[PDB]
Design a binder for this molecule. Structure first.
Ligand SMILES: [Ca+2]
Ligand SMILES: [Cl-]
Ligand SMILES: [Cl-]
Length: 162
């Protein structure tokens, strides 16, 4: 088990443009196209991401190329953020996977606003953090995409994906 297998379970594959739990336009392995309510914008966003007229539908190899890029972006997003990096770097290996997962799904900005959870995580207060994440807007709207991640932050094992 690793971050790619983890996200493949959580986001699955979709080779046609769907609206995600947050209500935004998405494709592949959880690749967000835009937060605009306009489908045709997301349709052009796909074409721009791949380098061709898709046009709303991509292949499996292209999805995996986007997936590598997005996981890279999530890691870089964490390391570049002053709030997230010190918390991240305090985490053990498995919880760091949960952290990459949450940023991949929610984006850096959303996550960095969870100020008290970040504090609880840095001080290894796993139970409270789990509870506080459980009452998030992320969790309440995306409970199936979020559930295993919260549990991972609590236990620091891979058991929720087993
Ligand atoms: Ca690392
Ligand atoms: Cl892999
Ligand atoms: Cl969900």
């Amino acid at each position: 088990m690793n971050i790619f297998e983890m996200l493949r379970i959580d986001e699955g594959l979709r080779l046609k443009i769907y609206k995600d739990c947050e209500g935004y336009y998405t494709i592949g392995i959880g690749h967000l196209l835009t937060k605009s309510p306009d489908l045709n914008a997301a349709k052009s966003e796909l074409d721009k991401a791949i380098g061709r007229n898709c046009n709303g539908v991509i292949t499996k190899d292209e999805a995996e190329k986007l997936f590598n890029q997005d996981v890279d972006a999530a890691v870089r997003g964490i390391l570049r953020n002053a709030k997230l990096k010190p918390v991240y770097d305090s985490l053990d290996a498995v919880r760091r996977c949960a952290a990459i997962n949450e940023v991949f799904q929610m984006g850096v900005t959303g996550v960095a606003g969870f100020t008290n959870v970040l504090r609880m995580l840095q001080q290894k207060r796993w139970d409270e953090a789990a509870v506080n994440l459980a009452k998030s807007r992320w969790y309440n709207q995306c409970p199936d995409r979020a559930k295993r991640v919260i549990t991972t932050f609590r236990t620091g094992t891979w058991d929720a994906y087993k």
